[PDB]
Amino acid sequence: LKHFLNTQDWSRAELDALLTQAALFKRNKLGSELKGKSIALVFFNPSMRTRTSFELGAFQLGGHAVVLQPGKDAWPIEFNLGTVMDGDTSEHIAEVARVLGRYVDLIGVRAFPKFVDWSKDREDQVLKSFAKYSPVPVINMETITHPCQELAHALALQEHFGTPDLRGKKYVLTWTYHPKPLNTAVANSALTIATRMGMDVTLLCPTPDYILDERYMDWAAQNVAESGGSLQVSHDIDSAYAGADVVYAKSWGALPFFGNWEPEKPIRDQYQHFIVDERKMALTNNGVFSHCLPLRRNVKATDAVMDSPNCIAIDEAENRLHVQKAIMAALV
Template identity: 55%
Template sequence: MFNVKNKNFINTQDWSKEELDYVLTLAEDMKRNGWRKTVEGKTLAMLFFNPSLRTRTSFEVAMYQLGGHAITLQPGKDAWGIEIKEGVKMDGDAEEHIKEATNVLSRFCDAIAVRSFPKFQNWDEDKRDSTLATICKWSSKPVINMETIRHPCQELALMMAIRSHFNNRQEKKKFLLTWTYHPKPLNMAVANSAAMISTRYGMNLTILCPKGYDLDKTFIDIASKNAVAYGGKVTVTDDIRLAYSGADFVYAKSWGSLEYYGRWDEEKKIRDGQKHFIVDSDKMKLTNNAFFSHCLPLRRNIKATDEVVDSKNSLIYEEAENRLHTERALLSAILGNNG
C-alpha cells in the first residue's frame, strides 16, 4: 500500500499513477459525500510571490473545511522581502533569506505551499525553478507547488473534470492544447502541466501553436514518454484546422515564446500577428462536439469568444470548482490524520 503522507507535491511526474488516482478518487468522493476534519490542528503556510484568486481562495477554504488553518504570506508586501540566491551579500531590498524563512515556517507550520512565477528574463535560469527548489531544500515539512513552471494543482482539477465527463474513459480521446493570443507574454506552467497530465492519462495530445511558440523540449519529452507508457500519442502543429478536427477536449492557454524569451518587445511583434488563434465557434464546429476549458483568468474575446466560454460544453467553472475538491483531497492525503 502506497503512502503519500508528508510527501512533497511539486510535480505530478514525481507521483505514481496510483497515487494520483487515489487523490482524484478521494476528491470525487468528498464532492459527493462530504468530508471529515482530517487536518484538525494543522497549519499550512502559503507563500505567494505572485497574485492569486482561485489558488489562494481554494487552499484557504480547503484547510478551513478540513479543520485546519492556512496563513497567507506575500513576501515584500505583508512579509519581509526574501532573498533566494545563496552565498550573496544581502545589501539589496530583501530583508530575509529564504533559508531562515523556510526553517522558521517549518517549525511553525505543518506544510509550506509556494507560488513563484518565472522572472521572464532568462529561460535557462527560470527552468531551474530555483525558489521552489531552495524551499524544498531547507524545509523539514512537505512542500506544495501552487504554480511555478508547472501547475500540478491545476492538473488535478483539469483531470477531475475530464474523468467526470468521459466516465473515466479518457484514454485515446483527442486532447487539444491550443495556444491563444494574449497582449502579454504569459507563464508556460499550465500548458506544461496540461501536456503532462493528459498524456499521463492516456489521451492523444495535440499541441497547436504558432511557429516559435513550442513548449520547452523537457516537457514535450515527458509528454512523449507518458504517451508511450500509457497508450497515447503526441502531435505538435501550427495547422489550426488539422488540430481542431475531431478533438474531444479543447484546452486554451497563452504562453510566451521561448525563441524570443527575455526579448519581449521583439516577441510582441510576432505575437500580435497571431490573434486568429482565438477559440471561436467556427473552430469548435470542427471538433467532435468537444468540451472547452481554461484554467482562468481568461480575457474574453481575446483568448476565446463569449459564445465558446458561455456554451453548454464549457467546463471553466467546473474546473475552477475542482480546485477546491482536489486540494481538499490532496491536503487530507498529505497532512490528514487518516489521509
C-alpha cells in the same frame, strides 16, 4: 519527505488515488483530516482561485491557512546561496523555510518566472528551495508547472466523460492570443497531464518558436510511451481542432524570446485568430472547452464559447478545491 511539486514525481497509482479522494471530498466537503493543522500559503504573484480554494479547503478540513505575500506583508526573500544580502532581500529561504516549518504543517508556494532569462526561470529555484529547506511537505501552487491545476483538469474531464479512463480521447492543447507574453506553466502542466492520462495530445501553437521547453516535450513522450496515448505538434488550426474531444487554451510567450520580448509583440500580434471561437469548436467531435482562468474574453475565448454549455471551465475551477484537499490530506 513527500511533496507535491509535480504530478510527474508521482506514480499513476498515487495520482489515481488522489483523484478518487478528490471525488470523495466533493461528496463530503467537511472533514477533519487537517484538524488543528495549518498551511502557509506563500504567494509571490496574484491569485484568486488558488488562494480561495486553499484557504477554504484548510477550513473545511479543520485546519487553518495563513496567507503570506513576501514583499507586501511578509519580508522579501533571497534564494541564491552565498550571496551577500545588502540588497532588496531581507532574509534567506533557508531561514524562512525552517521557521515556517515550526509554525505550520504544510507550505504552499506560488512563484511565476521573472521573464528575464528562461535559463534561470526554468531551474524552478523557489519551489526547489522551499522543498530543500522545509521540514514539512511543500505544495506547488504554480511556478513553471501548475500541478494542482492538472488534477482539477483531469477530474473535470473524467467527470465529463463519466469515466476515469480517458484513453482514446483527442486532446488538443492550443496556444491562444494575449496582448502580453505569459507563463508556460499551465501549458507544461496540460501537456504533462494530458499525455499522462493516455490521450491523443496535439500541441497546437503558432510557430515552432512556441513549442514548449524540451523538458515537458520529453515528459510528454515518456508519458505517451507509458499510457498508450500519443503526442503531436501542429501549426494548422483546423486540422487540429478537427473532431477533438477536449480543447484546452492557454496563452504563453515563446521561450526563444525570453528576456527579449521586444521583437515578439509583432509576432504574437499576427495570430489573434488562434482565439477559440464557435468555428473551431464546431470542427470538434462535440468537444469540451476549458481554460485554467483568469481568462480574458474575446481575446482568448469568445463570449460565445465561454457561454457555451461545452465550456467546463467553472467545473474545472471548482475542482481545484476538491483535488487540493486530497493533496493536503495526503501529505500530512
